[PDB]
């Protein structure tokens, strides 16, 4: 029927002034207590680029080209083999040529290539999915490159809103990151065409996402509140159980695996089972932020170019925890060194300047509280694990741990404070495992690798645990 599209509630739109703009993390700090509730929000940039994105790509960068990927929008269920073969059949284009091709296919569909009204193209996307005869769209996802100008004059490029600068911003908890991560530490370019889509995802680590549209047609996002995440996944399986918008129906998967086989489904089904959905229609010059654990999907209305990066502030730390456990439960190597980030942030808060942590926003305060809580819980657990270990008498060696984060060979959880190493060095395990029941081919001698400064961190934990709101 598609009337639901017209009556979807829109997400909050903020239009700060230049003086309000500051940097995106402080701004998100300020607006968090309301936008948080929606999972998705939109910020109109009060700063214009002096050099537009096509010009920055053509002149500031040399021979910029990119390869595309082919998505099947909606068709008799595509099996994994057929899927994988055509995902990267896509040809390599030049910005100008991808634009030209997309606008030709758009003209072909609607006799003219002029942008069309948003309600029209959205209804068209959902009806095309339901019964369209077109098979595929080309989308240049995940391109490494940036359309912000390196020019010093450019007000947007020289601002702290440039995606290139965000991960190293003072309130970016990933500023502490050791090594770069594509899309996480550094932005990526997304270049779309008519009906090129991004299906429902919760991101990596429930981390925040920030996306800026540089140019082109509108982009429609559907966002779910972090609050609704469980309900979201619940309904999906039920409705995949119902054979409503049915997938391949394997019925033996982790949740993203199931999502990765479904034809993208309309928000109406989500509204029918009473899970909140908000719409954002993103134009050039607008940032869309997705909040940690906020599910979102979306599609393009035509040729367009956007730029996105994932980030974290301290309020994200509880969500990170949840992701970690799921990562472990699904026995998957985590994206981020969670424990290391807890420790580094917490010991930066410990030994603070203290001339800073006085009058500050409630959301930052809550994030600091969440960092301290994560730190205190981690140190208490590791203390009792170490006590148990010592009394077992199965731990032969103790070694000052000088490494970065390592991955436990059984669960796959990140280990920063401590791990138990073996004889060959290929079966280290986190302290969550009963060492008596370790059956390792290398032997039985177990060596505890422990961070050198554990005493300082224990003192920090005992300081924090007496502090207000950290119980």
């Amino acid at each position: 029927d598609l009337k639901w599209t017209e009556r979807l509630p829109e997400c909050p739109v903020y239009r700060p002034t230049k003086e309000e703009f500051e940097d995106p993390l402080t701004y998100l700090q300020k607006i968090f207590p309301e936008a948080s509730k929606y999972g998705i929000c939109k910020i109109v940039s009060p700063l214009t680029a002096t050099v537009p994105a096509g010009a920055v790509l053509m002149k500031e960068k040399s021979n910029f080209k990119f390869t595309t990927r082919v998505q099947p929008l909606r068709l008799a269920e595509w099996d994994s083999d057929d899927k994988v073969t055509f995902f990267m059949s896509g040809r390599t284009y030049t910005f100008r040529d991808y634009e030209k091709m997309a606008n030709k296919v758009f003209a072909r569909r609607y006799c003219s290539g002029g942008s069309l009204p948003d309600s029209f193209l959205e209804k068209e996307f959902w009806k095309e999915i339901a019964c369209g005869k077109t098979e595929t769209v080309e989308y240049a996802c995940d391109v490494d490159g940036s359309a912000f100008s390196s020019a010093p004059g450019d007000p947007l490029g020289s601002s702290k809103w440039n995606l290139n600068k965000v991960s190293r911003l003072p309130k970016s908890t990933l500023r502490l990151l050791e090594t770069s991560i594509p899309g996480v530490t550094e932005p990526m370019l997304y270049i779309g065409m008519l009906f090129s889509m991004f299906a429902w995802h919760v991101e990596d680590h429930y981390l925040y996402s920030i996306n800026y549209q540089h140019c082109g047609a509108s982009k429609t996002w559907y966002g779910i509140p972090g609050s609704a995440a469980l309900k979201f996944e619940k309904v999906v399986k039920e409705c995949v159980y119902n054979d409503d918008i049915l997938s391949t129906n394997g019925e033996d998967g982790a949740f993203d695996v199931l999502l990765g086989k479904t034809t993208i489904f309309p928000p109406k089904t989500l509204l029918d089972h009473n899970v909140p959905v908000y719409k954002a229609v993103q134009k050039p010059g607008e940032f869309v932020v997705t909040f940690p654990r906020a599910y979102h999907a979306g599609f393009s209305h035509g040729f367009n170019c956007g730029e996105a990066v994932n980030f974290a502030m301290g309020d994200w730390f509880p969500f990170g925890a949840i992701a970690s456990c799921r990562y472990a439960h699904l026995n998957r190597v985590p994206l981020l060194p969670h424990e290391e980030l807890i420790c580094k942030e917490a010991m930066l808060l410990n030994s603070s300047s203290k001339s800073e942590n006085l009058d500050l926003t409630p959301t930052e305060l809550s994030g600091q509280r969440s960092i301290k809580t994560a730190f205190v819980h981690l140190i208490r657990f590791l203390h009792l694990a170490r006590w148990s270990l010592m009394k077992s008498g199965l731990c032969t060696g103790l070694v000052s741990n000088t490494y970065g984060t390592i991955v436990c060979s059984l669960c796959k959880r990140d280990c920063y404070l401590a791990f138990i190493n073996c004889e060959c060095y290929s079966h280290p395990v986190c302290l969550r495992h009963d060492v008596k029941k370790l059956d390792l081919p290398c032997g039985t001698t177990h060596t505890l690798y422990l961070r050198d400064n554990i005493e300082d961190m224990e003192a920090a934990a005992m300081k924090f645990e007496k502090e207000d709101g950290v119980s």
Partner: peptide
């Protein structure tokens, strides 16, 4: 490896 995600 360190990265974001999709099917190749």
């Amino acid at each position: 490896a360190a990265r974001k995600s999709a099917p190749a």
